[PDB]
Amino acid sequence: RGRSASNEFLNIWGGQYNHTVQTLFALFKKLKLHNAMRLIKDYVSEDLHKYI
């Protein structure tokens, strides 16, 4: 009979775990995007410098 309160807890926990893991992945993407943009701006800058 206690399976109810256990499955309830496990269901809520799963959603919170997923919410946290999704946030982690979103942060990893945000970091990769930042590094890619930094790289692209450095390269653009390098290209333009030969016309200065």
Number of domains: 1
CATH class: Mainly Alpha
Q: Which structural class do you get from the secondary structure elements?
A: mainly alpha
Q: CATH H-level name... which superfamily?
A: Single helix bin
Any overview of this molecule?
This protein is mostly helical. It has a single domain, classed as Single helix bin (Single alpha-helices involved in coiled-coils or other helix-helix interfaces), CATH 1.20.5.530. 88% of the residues lie in helices and 0% in strands. The chain is built from 1 helix and no strands. 0% of the residues are buried. Belongs to the protein kinase superfamily. TKL Ser/Thr protein kinase family. Pelle subfamily. It is found in: Cell membrane; Cytoplasm. Interacts (via Death domain) with tub (via Death domain). Interacts with Pellino (Pli).
Short descriptors:
52 residues, rod-shaped, Serine/threonine-protein kinase pelle
Q: Briefly, what is this?
A:
With 52 residues, the chain is mainly alpha-helical. The protein has 1 helix and no strands.
Architecture blueprint of SSEs:
Blueprint: H1 3-48
Family: Belongs to the protein kinase superfamily. TKL Ser/Thr protein kinase family. Pelle subfamily.
Domain Death: 1-44
Organism: Drosophila melanogaster
